[PDB]
Write an enzyme that holds these catalytic residues in place. Structure first.
Site, PDB file in Angstrom:
ATOM      1  CG  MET A   1       7.103  -9.297  -1.251  1.00 12.64           C
ATOM      2  SD  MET A   1       7.001  -9.580  -3.009  1.00 12.64           S
ATOM      3  CE  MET A   1       7.119 -11.370  -3.096  1.00 12.64           C
ATOM      4  CB  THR A   2      -0.033 -10.177  -1.246  1.00 10.74           C
ATOM      5  OG1 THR A   2      -0.082  -9.365  -2.429  1.00 10.74           O
ATOM      6  CG2 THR A   2      -1.416 -10.219  -0.582  1.00 10.74           C
ATOM      7  CE1 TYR A   3      -1.205 -13.895  -1.828  1.00  8.28           C
ATOM      8  CE2 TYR A   3      -2.522 -14.031   0.191  1.00  8.28           C
ATOM      9  CZ  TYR A   3      -2.440 -13.921  -1.189  1.00  8.28           C
ATOM     10  OH  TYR A   3      -3.599 -13.861  -1.922  1.00  8.28           O
TER      11      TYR A   3
ATOM     12  CD  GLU B   1      11.186   3.018  13.665  1.00  3.65           C
ATOM     13  OE1 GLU B   1      10.671   4.031  13.135  1.00  3.65           O
ATOM     14  OE2 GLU B   1      10.705   2.456  14.683  1.00  3.65           O
ATOM     15  CB  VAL B   2       9.845  -1.915   7.823  1.00  2.00           C
ATOM     16  CG1 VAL B   2       9.155  -2.162   6.509  1.00  2.00           C
ATOM     17  CG2 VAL B   2      11.374  -2.083   7.672  1.00  2.00           C
TER      18      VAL B   2
ATOM     19  N   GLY C   1       5.318  -4.281  14.029  1.00  2.00           N
ATOM     20  CA  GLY C   1       6.609  -3.822  14.588  1.00  2.00           C
ATOM     21  C   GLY C   1       7.753  -4.832  14.589  1.00  2.00           C
ATOM     22  CD  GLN C   2       6.514  -9.667  11.750  1.00  2.00           C
ATOM     23  OE1 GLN C   2       7.124 -10.726  11.546  1.00  2.00           O
ATOM     24  NE2 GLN C   2       5.205  -9.544  11.537  1.00  2.00           N
TER      25      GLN C   2
ATOM     26  CE  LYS D   1      16.362  -1.059   7.657  1.00  2.00           C
ATOM     27  NZ  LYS D   1      17.389  -2.178   7.475  1.00  2.00           N
TER      28      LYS D   1
ATOM     29  NE  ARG E   1      15.962 -15.348  11.247  1.00  2.00           N
ATOM     30  CZ  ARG E   1      16.617 -16.515  11.333  1.00  2.00           C
ATOM     31  NH1 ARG E   1      16.011 -17.667  11.585  1.00  2.00           N
ATOM     32  NH2 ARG E   1      17.930 -16.516  11.151  1.00  2.00           N
ATOM     33  CG  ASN E   2      15.944 -12.397   7.001  1.00  2.00           C
ATOM     34  OD1 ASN E   2      15.296 -11.351   7.296  1.00  2.00           O
ATOM     35  ND2 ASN E   2      17.124 -12.686   7.537  1.00  2.00           N
TER      36      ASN E   2
ATOM     37  CG  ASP F   1      19.619  -9.107   5.279  1.00  2.00           C
ATOM     38  OD1 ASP F   1      19.274  -9.635   6.341  1.00  2.00           O
ATOM     39  OD2 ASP F   1      20.746  -8.646   5.132  1.00  2.00           O
TER      40      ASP F   1
ATOM     41  CG  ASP G   1      19.951 -13.632   9.542  1.00  2.00           C
ATOM     42  OD1 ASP G   1      19.724 -14.828   9.897  1.00  2.00           O
ATOM     43  OD2 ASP G   1      19.579 -12.658  10.221  1.00  2.00           O
TER      44      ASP G   1
HETATM   45  C1  LIG Z   1      11.537  -1.691   3.118  1.00  2.00           C
HETATM   46  C2  LIG Z   1      12.810  -2.514   2.854  1.00  2.00           C
HETATM   47  C3  LIG Z   1      14.094  -1.910   2.918  1.00  2.00           C
HETATM   48  C4  LIG Z   1      15.247  -2.690   2.680  1.00  2.00           C
HETATM   49  C5  LIG Z   1      15.120  -4.071   2.413  1.00  2.00           C
HETATM   50  N1  LIG Z   1      16.293  -4.821   2.061  1.00  2.00           N
HETATM   51  C6  LIG Z   1      16.432  -6.123   1.732  1.00  2.00           C
HETATM   52  O1  LIG Z   1      15.540  -6.923   1.865  1.00  2.00           O
HETATM   53  C7  LIG Z   1      17.795  -6.641   1.284  1.00  2.00           C
HETATM   54  C8  LIG Z   1      17.855  -7.822   0.546  1.00  2.00           C
HETATM   55  C9  LIG Z   1      19.051  -8.371   0.103  1.00  2.00           C
HETATM   56  C10 LIG Z   1      20.223  -7.689   0.374  1.00  2.00           C
HETATM   57  C11 LIG Z   1      21.555  -8.268  -0.093  1.00  2.00           C
HETATM   58  N2  LIG Z   1      22.585  -8.165   0.980  1.00  2.00           N
HETATM   59  C12 LIG Z   1      23.890  -8.623   0.469  1.00  2.00           C
HETATM   60  C13 LIG Z   1      25.013  -8.299   1.479  1.00  2.00           C
HETATM   61  N3  LIG Z   1      24.716  -8.976   2.758  1.00  2.00           N
HETATM   62  C14 LIG Z   1      25.807  -8.809   3.750  1.00  2.00           C
HETATM   63  C15 LIG Z   1      23.410  -8.463   3.275  1.00  2.00           C
HETATM   64  C16 LIG Z   1      22.241  -8.748   2.297  1.00  2.00           C
HETATM   65  C17 LIG Z   1      20.188  -6.509   1.088  1.00  2.00           C
HETATM   66  C18 LIG Z   1      18.996  -5.973   1.563  1.00  2.00           C
HETATM   67  C19 LIG Z   1      13.849  -4.666   2.311  1.00  2.00           C
HETATM   68  C20 LIG Z   1      12.695  -3.897   2.553  1.00  2.00           C
HETATM   69  N4  LIG Z   1      11.485  -4.497   2.473  1.00  2.00           N
HETATM   70  C21 LIG Z   1      10.829  -5.016   3.537  1.00  2.00           C
HETATM   71  N5  LIG Z   1      11.335  -4.989   4.803  1.00  2.00           N
HETATM   72  C22 LIG Z   1      10.636  -5.468   5.852  1.00  2.00           C
HETATM   73  C23 LIG Z   1       9.383  -6.008   5.624  1.00  2.00           C
HETATM   74  C24 LIG Z   1       8.877  -6.013   4.320  1.00  2.00           C
HETATM   75  C25 LIG Z   1       7.574  -6.552   3.931  1.00  2.00           C
HETATM   76  C26 LIG Z   1       6.772  -7.173   4.901  1.00  2.00           C
HETATM   77  C27 LIG Z   1       5.519  -7.701   4.543  1.00  2.00           C
HETATM   78  C28 LIG Z   1       5.134  -7.564   3.205  1.00  2.00           C
HETATM   79  N6  LIG Z   1       5.916  -6.964   2.274  1.00  2.00           N
HETATM   80  C29 LIG Z   1       7.134  -6.455   2.589  1.00  2.00           C
HETATM   81  N7  LIG Z   1       9.598  -5.516   3.316  1.00  2.00           N
END
Ligand SMILES: Cc1ccc(NC(=O)c2ccc(CN3CCN(C)CC3)cc2)cc1Nc1nccc(-c2cccnc2)n1
Ligand SMILES: O=C(Nc1ccc(OC(F)(F)F)cc1)c1cccc(CN2CCOCC2)c1
Ligand SMILES: [Cl-]
Length: 285
Positions: A93-95, A32-33, A28-29, A48, A142-143, A156, A138
């Protein structure tokens, strides 16, 4: 709609039924993913969704991810946004996240060469976002995510009001990660690629320390004032001087004096062309 023939066609739109929704991700960290499966590919995905004015930032995040494609940015696989519940699907992402990965990893495996590699991959994704005129806002361990073979991708997760604890704190009507935030961003609300450069330097320190908390034992109310008076984190133990010099560059007071990501990335690829990080780390030590 779903057929190439339609005016309403979007290649990113997928069949919701095509995806088998499993449990929430990381207890839940990440809000809603949800872990998911793309049936036909037998592929785990991360999905998500929206929980019960908030639609347009989610749709814009979808909009943006359609715009970007890099080996080191988490990859959009599709969307469900034709009708609620709205989904955004990426690769899984596996890890998991790089921050926990760094703290929990076997250090015989995750050596200086692997850390350098992880920092390099991040700087490339940021070079890309620089070049496409995006800002992350950000950037932090953690991201980021970690896959097979020390593959790192920049994500992100929208963590500011999801993360519990003092990582993000109230500032300017919003939640900031104060210890990653560039001075001009805290003082003047000025956000830019150069303030991503500042956060990248803090990210670099997180890699170099295996995910220690930055400015450890320093009160948040004191960060800006220390920074303003030219205080910086000290060289982590084992950190080669050149990597620390790079951190110090990222943490220039004047954003304009901070290297671009292209130069940062160029420095990683150059810095050890003729000498191993292993030799330097052992030298330092
Ligand atoms: C499910 C999903 C939906 C949306 C996103 N989005 C992004 O990750 C992202 C990355 C870069 C940008 C670029 N952006 C540019 C503009 N500025 C202002 C914001 C960032 C935007 C969104 C990720 C995910 N994936 C995601 N989210 C949470 C956890 C995990 C996850 C956790 C553990 C193992 N594998 C995957 N995976
Ligand atoms: O690897 C280290 N530091 C480092 C810094 C920067 C860096 O570059 C980049 F770009 F940031 F990735 C890469 C690595 C390291 C840290 C602590 C201890 C030891 C070895 N020792 C083992 C026994 O105990 C004592 C410590 C090594
Ligand atoms: Cl942007």
């Amino acid at each position: 709609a779903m057929d190439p023939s339609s005016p309403n066609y979007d290649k990113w739109e997928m069949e919701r039924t095509d995806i088998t929704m499993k449990h929430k991700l990381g207890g839940g960290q990440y809000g809603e993913v949800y872990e998911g499966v793309w049936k036909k590919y037998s592929l785990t995905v991360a999905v998500k969704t929206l929980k019960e004015m908030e639609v347009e930032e989610f749709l814009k995040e979808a909009a943006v991810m359609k715009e970007i494609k890099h080996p080191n940015l988490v990859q959009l696989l599709g969307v469900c946004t034709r009708e609620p519940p709205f989904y955004i699907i990426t690769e899984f992402m596996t890890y998991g996240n790089l921050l926990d990965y760094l703290r929990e990893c076997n250090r015989q495996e995750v050596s200086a060469v692997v850390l350098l590699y992880m920092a390099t991959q991040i700087s490339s994704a940021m070079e890309y976002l620089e070049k496409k005129n995006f800002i992350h806002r950000d950037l932090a361990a953690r991201n980021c995510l970690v896959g097979e073979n020390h593959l790192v991708k920049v994500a992100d997760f929208g963590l500011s009001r999801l993360m519990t604890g003092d990582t993000y704190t109230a500032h300017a009507g919003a939640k900031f990660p104060i210890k990653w935030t560039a001075p001009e961003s805290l003082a003047y609300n000025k956000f830019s690629i150069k303030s991503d450069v500042w956060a990248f330097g803090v990210l670099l320190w997180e890699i170099a320390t295996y995910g220690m908390s930055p400015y450890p034992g320093i009160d948040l109310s004191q960060v800006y004032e220390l920074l303003e008076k030219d205080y910086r984190m000290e060289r982590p133990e084992g950190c080669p001087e050149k990597v620390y010099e790079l951190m110090r560059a990222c943490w220039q007071w004047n954003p304009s004096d901070r290297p671009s990501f292209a130069e940062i990335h160029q420095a990683f690829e150059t810095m050890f062309q003729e000498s191993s990080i292993s030799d330097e780390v052992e030298k330092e030590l």
